[PDB]
Each structure stands twice: as C-alpha cells, then as structure tokens.
Amino acid sequence: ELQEKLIAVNRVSKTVKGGRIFSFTALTVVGDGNGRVGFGYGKAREVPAAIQKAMEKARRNMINVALNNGTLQHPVKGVHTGSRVFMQPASEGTGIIAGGAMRAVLEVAGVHNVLAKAYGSTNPINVVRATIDGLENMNSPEMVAAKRGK
RNA sequence: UGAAGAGUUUGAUCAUGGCUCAGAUUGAACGCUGGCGGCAGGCCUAACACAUGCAAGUCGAACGGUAACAGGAAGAAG
C-alpha cells in the first residue's frame, strides 16, 4: 500500500558568496506498512529532486511503534527542545484535526482516531521529530499482556 | 456529553519572547441599502424636570337614600 506523504515545501531565496539561492527544501514520511515509521529531509534545486533527496532517507529512517488495531487508546506526550506534541483518543467518527505534520505522521502509522495539539515552537522540522518522540512514547495492550504477572 | 491552526525578529537558522487574524455576544450607535410574517427587545443617559390626559376601583345578598333607566302608580299635563 501507498501511505507516503509530503509535509511542507520551503523556498530558499537568500544571497550568499556563491550568488543568490533558488532552491527548495522538502520534508516527507514513508514507513513500512507493518509497524515502522520514519521521516526524511532534503534541499535541492528542483522540487521533485528535493522530494527524492528527502524520500530516499525517509525510506531508510525507521522506528518501530506499538499500533494496537491501527488506533490510539491512551493519552500521549512528545517532546523535542522547544516543540511539544499532545495526542489523545477521539470518539466514534472523529479524528485529525491539527497541524499538517501530525496529519502525515499518523497516515504512515495507519491511524486517524487522534485529537492532536501542538505547544511551544510550531517549527516543522522539530514538531515532526517531536511527534516521532511521542510515538516512542506509544504503548499497547498486547505488550502489557506480556508484562503482567511474574 | 470533550481538545488548533495561521501571519510575524534575519543575511540565515534554532531557541527565548512579546505582538496579530479567521470567531462571537450587545437595550448597541452610524452610513450605504431594505421585500413578507411571527416571536423577543426597545430612555441604561440627567436620582434633572413637567403643562395635558390616563393609570383603581367596587359591593344595595351590610344600608339611611333616590342622582338616573325599565315596570306600576300619581301628576304638572300631554
């Protein structure tokens, strides 16, 4: 299945000793379609090449996440320095909501049922890794079943 | 009876930090402009001040009476 997404495109326009920049920086997400998620970043002269520079590392970057029935069931926080994320379970027929970064990271996890909010710096390249830090913080009833007793 | 986001410090970027916008209520008020109806609201101001009128009356099954209308009678007459 295809799940891969583009979060943001940013145009670079400053002047340097090599001349004036005409480049684009991209941020993307992919995952494995079975339990892993990841992201990638990259700058290039053309947007399809920036997207590929990002996608090729977004196809390598992985972390495993406990994703019981493709849904969130507990309240969870995530952090990266100035950027914070908070995610909670939604009701029947409700879900995302929130900034375009969280909206993409949850699709590569197969999830929709989340009430999401961001706090502090809304910076995209931090709030993405703060969302992934919040998925390191995600737990499952199937893993707690292997912890209980003894 | 349930959960955000976006504009914005620069030659850049990331923190830290304040500013801003889509929204809404009202005895509102102003201007352009205004087809029907129902329901609601309509002197917050000068606790400053009024000509005029209305707004709180009524019972004769408590009653001395009779200003009137019916009915009888009397009578001035007609």
Using the structure block, give the residue that is written with the tokens 């931090």. A126
d(CA A111, CA A25): 27
Say whether the CB atom of A86 is under 7 angstroms from strand B.
yes
**A25 within 8 A of A12, measured Cβ to Cβ:** yes
Instruction: With CA atoms as reference, report the closest residue to A110 among A13, A57, A31.
Output: A31
**Which bases of chain B are contacted by protein, using any atom under 7 A from a CB?**
2-6, 11-16
Instruction: With CA atoms as reference, report the closest residue to A132 among A40, A57, A6.
Output: A40
Say whether the CB atom of A122 is under 7 angstroms from strand B.
yes
Q: Which nucleotide is nearest to A88 (CA to C1')?
A: B3
Say whether the CB atom of A19 is under 7 angstroms from strand B.
no
Non-local (6+) Cβ contacts of A1 within 8 A are: A33
d(CA A85, CA A96): 14
Resolution in A: 9.0
